[PDB]
Design a protein around this ligand. Structure first.
Ligand SMILES: *[C@@H]1O[C@H](CO)[C@@H](O[C@@H]2O[C@H](CO)[C@@H](O)[C@H](O)[C@H]2NC(C)=O)[C@H](O)[C@H]1NC(C)=O
Ligand SMILES: *[C@@H]1O[C@H](CO)[C@@H](O[C@@H]2O[C@H](CO)[C@@H](O)[C@H](O)[C@H]2NC(C)=O)[C@H](O)[C@H]1NC(C)=O
Ligand SMILES: *[C@@H]1O[C@H](CO)[C@@H](O)[C@H](O)[C@H]1NC(C)=O
Ligand SMILES: *[C@@H]1O[C@H](CO)[C@@H](O)[C@H](O)[C@H]1NC(C)=O
Ligand SMILES: *[C@@H]1O[C@H](CO)[C@@H](O)[C@H](O)[C@H]1NC(C)=O
Ligand SMILES: *[C@@H]1O[C@H](CO)[C@@H](O)[C@H](O)[C@H]1NC(C)=O
Ligand SMILES: *[C@@H]1O[C@H](CO)[C@@H](O)[C@H](O)[C@H]1NC(C)=O
Ligand SMILES: *[C@@H]1O[C@H](CO)[C@@H](O)[C@H](O)[C@H]1NC(C)=O
Ligand SMILES: *[C@@H]1O[C@H](CO)[C@@H](O)[C@H](O)[C@H]1NC(C)=O
Ligand SMILES: *[C@@H]1O[C@H](CO)[C@@H](O)[C@H](O)[C@H]1NC(C)=O
Ligand SMILES: *[C@@H]1O[C@H](CO)[C@@H](O)[C@H](O)[C@H]1NC(C)=O
Ligand SMILES: *[C@@H]1O[C@H](CO)[C@@H](O)[C@H](O)[C@H]1NC(C)=O
Lengths: 375, 211, 318
């Protein structure tokens, strides 16, 4: 009742039914499922390499079939730059990727700023370009306490496409030798997952409301066995709102259906607060066994009203033929459409008025509205 | 007068219009407290702190939000205005057909048979008092479609033939007023063989008793 | 509103609050429409003070009403014609549907009462108490009401009853042969279904964001970046919902106007005899019978149509 009062911004409530809130079942536990992968990803093969390629001819290492722990680099104290785009550097271990690509090259300190999406310049345009829709992390460090003639492209007919590597040496109507040396590794983040961060798995739980993470896919809902005929390559299905309604368990290859946890509107049935502070609550389209004088109707689960067999004129409508009233306590009943009357019809019988009455009735109609004006 | 004085909800139709518009205006004003992503809902507080290249960004958010709020208000008023116009047109029709005449339209000017109406002025509207005739205290009579007399079928000119159990009379339909069946209140069409349920009675010719 | 836009995301919900009362206004507008829909139904069908019943013996002088009266051997007490009319004609994104206050059975009961009333007491029950009259006599009064003398009815009673009975039989056969007959009711159903599907599909749009899915944004970005992407989705989703509600208010107004016309016809065509040309069908109106239909009403209008005219010489006076 207090909820109704706050909803209506008043300390009094008139007779009627009001929607004040929403019922929702909360999750009990978190179900985490990742592919069973044992070996660690060869990031070190790129980062602790004896030699890095020139910027005009950068190298690419493909990372696949492995566990990608990025906290070793993030916390590693050695870098001058650790800038992530589209992802966060401290959340990378909770992500799964189709592929991870580690690009590596040598640059001068004054180009460090060019290793980014949305950039222009001699490196950004002729040697190493990132797309504006870039997802990945750029990691760079000062390597002048470690280390020769490295080249960059100075002349070209046109600019490079994202991730293009032009290593030709035609004459321009192109390369020049390289203020501290920097080593740069760019981790580009790209189906079933192939590369996942350390995240331990839990047991699969079904027929309960749970939080979940399936191979990087997150959401809340009830998991049940699916009868969907997934093809051997399909991992998940999608609805018209582009939501996930089924997944393939990454360890058991079991197809699970996802049904969002029960919820529905909550409305309060009340006589005016001038008469009584008793209320009844209707859980719209909710089953009374899910909600925890309990009357299940088509409108929803009505709790607090006593159902009776006597039919009365409708007072506060519930829906589907059911009305409620205060008679004291709150009751629920099927509404009457009026008293019955059998007319004494016969092929030779007529009824004729022998008297009459003069009646006066009232009809009220709106004619006009306040003439507001807003500057 | 006694009925209206005892029922606060009687004018709910007029009060609803007042309440809906008042609610719409209060909603519009309250939206001025929303920042819509800005550092502040108040333009003066933005301007006293930020320089133009930064101030304009914060102002842009408030303009977008406030313009959207005002557009929502106006759209709702146009829709509501259309409903009021339809009501006013109905009220004008009732004035012409219920007050300036007598209507034959069922339930157009209230329940019962319309006699007349009287308008009364009301805040933002009109109230009609409809005066109607309602039949009362009906009685069971035996009837027939026609009377058979001297080989001819007699039908009522205006009323209906009724019997009180021993005698036949002709009466007006909406008020019992039995009269002797005569040649002046019936007409003849065809013989007594065609009509289903025809009964034998005497039709009085008001000539021979004097001639 | 809140669920449609933000689902169960806390970060989105807190940003949505920065827009003030827009969700309150939208939820309120839809509530107002839902209430109107029960009002519309009540105004059309609940025009009878008492629930009238027909007699056990259907003797109406040759007039057969079995196709418009309820069929007692059916779960639904619907008439043969109503049964035909009825046979012929999101949830997890915050979009639900509320049931009508008056169920189909209850509406059928109102219709039955109106039919029993007009068959046994003519128009009297619509003005005051129901006064019984023999059906053939009621029809004779309706003939006088169109400028035809009452003996025309009585001298042709078998012919008139036969033409009436035939015409009713042809209504059922006509409806069963023409799928488009109920297009007026189907159009309402199709327009609202289309509007809801459009609203749901908009949840697949990113509106400039990196993703259409809030969970995918939140699992990747930290608040200072995540909020930017969420802001774009809120703006787009709020705009999509506002568009939906505006269209429903306009459509609701059209339905209200139709319901008001239907209620007027119930009063003037069913509870009386109309003198308004083409208000209760072509020809001279005699009487009408309502039938219940999904989300609407069907009127069967019985009219007198002149036939087989002949050329005569005339004069204004003798
Ligand atoms: C009233 O009309 C119905 C038809 O609408 C009559 O019922 C039909 O009777 C014929 C035989 O003459 C049967 O072949 C049909 O199958 C029946 N149809 C239905 C739906 O029952 C009914 O007999 C008529 N009643 C009266 C008193 O004449
Ligand atoms: C008025 O029209 C009706 C309807 O056409 C005529 O009734 C038909 O007459 C033919 C010929 O005898 C019969 O075969 C049909 O079965 C009758 N129809 C019905 C429904 O009974 C009627 O005879 C015409 N009357 C006049 C004076 O022309
Ligand atoms: C490279 O080796 C250094 C020094 O042992 C270590 O600090 C760093 O984590 C290593 N990085 C990679 C990518 O293996
Ligand atoms: C991986 O998990 C699946 C599903 O639980 C199980 O069937 C399989 O034996 C596991 N394989 C390894 C290598 O652990
Ligand atoms: C509350 O109920 C009493 C008793 O019927 C009545 O006199 C009083 O006016 C009511 N007050 C309000 C605000 O309705
Ligand atoms: C509620 O759930 C029970 C199963 O526990 C089921 O039998 C019943 O039909 C359901 N009722 C509704 C309205 O869904
Ligand atoms: C209503 O009637 C049913 C029998 O149809 C009975 O089982 C039920 O207990 C009754 N309820 C009340 C409140 O009388
Ligand atoms: C007419 O007679 C019937 C009995 O057949 C009775 O029920 C009805 O009330 C009577 N009507 C009047 C007006 O007396
Ligand atoms: C019918 O009316 C006549 C004339 O007033 C009267 O004499 C007769 O007794 C009445 N019959 C009955 C059954 O009331
Ligand atoms: C009225 O019905 C009776 C049977 O109860 C019958 O004998 C009589 O002829 C019928 N009268 C008319 C006018 O149909
Ligand atoms: C009326 O009287 C005649 C005799 O003149 C008789 O043949 C006929 O059947 C009677 N009709 C009725 C309805 O009593
Ligand atoms: C009346 O006569 C005209 C010829 O002047 C003819 O065309 C028309 O069809 C006739 N109408 C009738 C009802 O016979």
């Amino acid at each position: 009742l207090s909820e109704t009062k706050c909803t209506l911004k008043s300390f009094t409530v008139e007779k009627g039914i009001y929607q004040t809130s929403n019922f929702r079942v909360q999750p009990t536990e978190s179900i985490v499922r990742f592919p069973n992968i044992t070996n660690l990803c060869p990031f070190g093969e790129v980062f602790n390499a004896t030699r890095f390629a020139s910027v005009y001819a950068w190298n690419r290492k493909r990372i696949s079939n492995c566990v990608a722990d990025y906290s070793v680099l993030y916390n590693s104290a050695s870098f001058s730059t650790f800038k992530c785009y589209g992802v966060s550097p401290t959340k990378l271990n909770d992500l799964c990727f189709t592929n991870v690509y580690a690009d590596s090259f040598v640059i001068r300190g004054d180009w460090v700023r060019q290793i980014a999406p949305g950039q222009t310049g001699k490196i950004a345009d002729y040697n190493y370009k990132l797309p504006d829709d870039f997802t990945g992390c750029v990691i760079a460090w000062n390597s002048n306490n470690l280390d020769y003639n490295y080249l960059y492209r100075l002349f070209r007919k046109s600019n490079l496409k994202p991730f293009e590597r032009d290593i030709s040496t035609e004459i321009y109507q192109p390369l020049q030798s390289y203020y501290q040396p920097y080593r740069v590794v760019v981790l580009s983040f790209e189906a079933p997952a192939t590369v996942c961060g350390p995240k331990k798995s839990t047991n699969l739980v079904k027929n309960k409301c749970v939080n979940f993470n399936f191979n990087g896919l997150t959401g809340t809902g009830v998991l049940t066995e699916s009868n969907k005929k997934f093809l051997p390559f399909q991992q998940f299905g999608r609805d018209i709102a582009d939501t996930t309604d089924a997944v393939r368990d990454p360890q058991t290859l079991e197809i699970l259906d996802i049904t969002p946890c029960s919820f529905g509107g909550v409305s309060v049935i009340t006589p005016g607060t001038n008469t009584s502070n008793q209320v009844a609550v209707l859980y719209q389209d909710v089953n009374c066994t899910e909600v925890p004088n309990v009357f299940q109707t088509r409108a929803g689960c009505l709790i607090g009203a006593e159902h009776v067999n006597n039919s009365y004129e409708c007072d506060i409508p519930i829906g589907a033929g059911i009305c409620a009233s205060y008679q004291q306590s709150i009751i629920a009943y099927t509404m009457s459409l009026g008293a019955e009357n059998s007319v004494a019809y016969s092929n030779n019988s007529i009824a004729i008025p022998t008297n009459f009455t003069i009646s006066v009735t009232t009809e009220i109609l709106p004619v006009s509205m306040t003439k507001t004006s807003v500057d | 007068q006694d009925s209206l004085s005892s029922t606060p909800s009687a004018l709910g139709k007029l009060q609803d219009v007042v309440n809906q518009n008042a609610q719409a205006l209060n909603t519009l004003v309250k939206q001025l407290s929303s920042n819509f992503g800005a550092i502040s809902s108040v333009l003066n507080d933005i301007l006293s702190r930020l320089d133009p290249p930064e101030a304009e960004v914060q102002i842009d958010r408030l303009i977008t939000g406030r313009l959207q709020s005002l557009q929502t208000y106006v759209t709702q008023q146009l829709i509501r205005a259309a409903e009021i116009r339809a009501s006013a047109n109905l009220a004008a029709t009732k004035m012409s057909e219920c007050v300036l005449g007598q209507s034959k339209r069922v339930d157009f000017c209230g329940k019962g048979y319309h006699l007349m109406s009287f308008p009364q002025s009301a805040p933002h509207g009109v109230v009609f008092l409809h005066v109607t005739y309602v039949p009362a205290q009906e009685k069971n009579f035996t009837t027939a479609p026609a009377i058979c007399h001297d080989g001819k079928a007699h039908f009522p000119r205006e009323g209906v033939f009724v019997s009180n159990g021993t005698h036949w009379f002709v009466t007006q339909r909406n008020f019992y007023e039995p009269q002797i069946i005569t040649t002046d209140n019936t007409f003849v069409s065809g013989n007594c063989d065609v009509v289903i349920g025809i009964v034998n009675n005497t039709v009085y010719d008001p000539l021979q008793p004097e001639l | 509103c809140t669920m449609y836009i933000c689902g169960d995301s806390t970060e989105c919900s807190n940003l949505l609050l920065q827009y003030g009362s827009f969700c309150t206004q939208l939820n309120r507008a839809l509530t107002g429409i839902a209430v109107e829909q029960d009002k519309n139904t009540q105004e059309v069908f609940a025009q009878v003070k008492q629930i009238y019943k027909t007699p056990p013996i259907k003797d109406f002088g040759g007039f057969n009403f079995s196709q418009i009266l309820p069929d007692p051997s059916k779960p639904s007490k619907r008439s043969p014609i109503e049964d035909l009319l009825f046979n012929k004609v999101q949830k997890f994104n915050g979009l639900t549907v509320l049931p009508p206050l008056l169920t189909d059975e209850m509406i059928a009961q109102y219709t039955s009462a109106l039919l029993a009333g007009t068959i046994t007491s003519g128009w009297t029950f619509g003005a005051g108490p129901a006064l019984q009259i023999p059906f053939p006599m009621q029809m004779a009064y309706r003939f006088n009401g169109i400028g035809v003398t009452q003996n025309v009815l009585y001298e042709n009673q078998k012919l008139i009853a036969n033409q009436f009975n035939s015409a009713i039989g042809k209504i059922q056969d006509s409806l069963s042969s023409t799928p488009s007959a109920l297009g007026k009711l189907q159009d309402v159903v199709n327009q609202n279904a289309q509007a809801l599907n459009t609203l749901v599909k908009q949840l697949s749009s990113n509106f400039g964001a990196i993703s259409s899915v809030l969970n995918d944004i939140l699992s990747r970005l930290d608040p200072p970046e995540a909020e930017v992407q969420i802001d774009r989705l809120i703006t787009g989703r709020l705009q999509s919902l506002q568009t939906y509600v505006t269209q429903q208010l306009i459509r609701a107004a059209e339905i209200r106007a139709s319901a008001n016309l239907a209620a007027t016809k119930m009063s003037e065509c069913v509870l009386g005899q109309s003198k308004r040309v083409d208000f209760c069908g072509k020809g001279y109106h005699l009487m009408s019978f309502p039938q219940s239909a999904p989300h609407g009403v069907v009127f069967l209008h019985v009219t007198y149509v002149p036939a087989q005219e002949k050329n005569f010489t005339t004069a204004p006076a003798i």
